[PDB]
């Protein structure tokens, strides 16, 4: 019956506020309250009421209630997976998203399913130092390796820092963070000695930087 | 040596994908390097540089580095009190950012200090409902309540329930949130009967929009 439910958008800053205070069930209890009217007055595609639950699930996983994330997500992909194409921006979040409450479920190659389709997508959308893009090759990689392939978290960061070699400067914080993501995939990989090697050259190449 | 150090910004939003996955520490690894890379080439009044400051101690924060984070903050809040006005929106936050951390470091007082001054600025620039002016009242009530000053606590919350009475509908999150932060100012300062009344009154409203 509030006129303008769309706009009750406003209460994620105050969602976040509580939860950067520890306040994480405050958060919870709001954005619960925000689902609910939505509920009533907004149709399931409206994509206020998407973002609100997008950001109550975001809100649960903060709280520790990663099966509530998991389920509300669920639902959000899955309409829109019928509502909005591939490469909308909002599918791809809310895909990330339940990836990474899977990966907290311990549903792990759901999570890789998803990954790759993100990052599949955001190959196409974004340009390759995009930190969205960046940060789902990362947990695509870390994916992998908790669902037995590890080998092939380890092609696709080689990849991210072969490309990385050739558009960013060595120092440049996301060429040493897919450094470091990829010398852990070499660790878990059996490739130990490359891996201290690499962590050794980040770990200069910080010192350099941070303490000249 | 880096063309546009400036653009580092980028990298706030790769910190947070990694904070949300429970990379705290790689957050912090990562925008260490950005603070470090433009400490060489932006003045310490340049806007960006003490944006990345600031993210930099929220990364510090939550990878438990209270301490860091407070000295940090203290950097920045003193050169933004000589740069910028009271009024200006970035002053303000790096304000509520260090009692932030100063509460987290037992250093009520300096948050209880800051807070007033947030409060009493927001309160002319911000309307009532805005989100960061709620959470700055709600942080300075529980600020107060840590200080020996529960009283004044109450009459802050009480303060903001009275006029939210007048301008949200009584379903409203904010409305909910505000009567939630008085009845646990209520309970601090012995008005306990008064409290439980609140909070059922609040529950009340929540089942009644969420399990109708």
Same mark, same amino acid.
């Given at each position: 019956?509030?006129?303008?439910?769309?706009? *009750?958008?406003?209460?994620?800053?105050?969602?976040?506020?509580?939860?950067?205070?520890?306040?994480? #069930?405050?958060?919870?209890?709001?954005?619960? #309250?925000?689902?609910?009217? #939505?509920?009533?007055?907004?149709?399931? @595609?409206?994509?206020?009421?998407?973002?609100?639950?997008? /950001?109550?699930?975001?809100?649960?996983?903060?709280?520790?209630?990663?099966?509530?994330?998991?389920? *509300?997500?669920?639902?959000?992909?899955?309409?829109?997976?019928?509502?909005?194409?591939?490469?909308?921006?909002?599918?791809?979040?809310?895909?990330?998203?339940?990836?990474?409450?899977?990966? =907290?479920?311990?549903?792990?190659?759901?999570?890789?399913?998803?990954?790759?389709?993100? +990052?599949?997508?955001?190959?196409?959308?974004?340009?390759?130092?995009?930190?969205?893009?960046?940060?789902?090759?990362?947990?695509?990689?870390?994916?992998?390796?908790? &669902?037995?392939?590890?080998? /092939?978290?380890? @092609?696709?960061?080689?990849? +991210?820092?072969?490309?990385?070699?050739?558009?960013?400067?060595? @120092?440049?914080?996301?060429?040493?963070?897919? #450094?470091?993501?990829?010398?852990?995939?070499?660790?878990? &990989?059996?490739?130990?000695?490359?891996?201290?090697?690499?962590?050794?050259?980040?770990?200069?190449?910080? =010192?350099?930087?941070?303490?000249?």
């Amino acid at each position: 019956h509030m006129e303008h439910p769309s706009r *009750l958008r406003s209460q994620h800053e105050l969602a976040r506020r509580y939860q950067q205070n520890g306040q994480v #069930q405050e958060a919870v209890e709001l954005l619960e #309250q925000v689902v609910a009217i #939505q509920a009533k007055t907004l149709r399931s @595609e409206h994509p206020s009421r998407l973002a609100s639950q997008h /950001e109550l699930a975001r809100a649960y996983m903060a709280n520790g209630q990663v099966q509530e994330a998991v389920e *509300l997500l669920e639902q959000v992909v899955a309409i829109q997976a019928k509502t909005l194409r591939s490469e909308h921006p909002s599918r791809l979040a809310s895909q990330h998203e339940l990836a990474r409450a899977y990966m =907290a479920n311990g549903q792990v190659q759901e999570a890789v399913e998803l990954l790759e389709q993100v +990052v599949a997508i955001q190959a196409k959308t974004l340009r390759s130092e995009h930190p969205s893009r960046l940060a789902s090759q990362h947990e695509l990689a870390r994916a992998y390796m908790a &669902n037995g392939q590890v080998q /092939e978290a380890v @092609e696709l960061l080689e990849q +991210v820092v072969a490309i990385q070699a050739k558009t960013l400067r060595s @120092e440049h914080p996301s060429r040493l963070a897919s #450094q470091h993501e990829l010398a852990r995939a070499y660790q878990a &990989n059996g490739q130990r000695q490359e891996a201290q090697e690499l962590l050794e050259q980040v770990r200069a190449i910080q =010192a350099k930087t941070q303490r000249s």
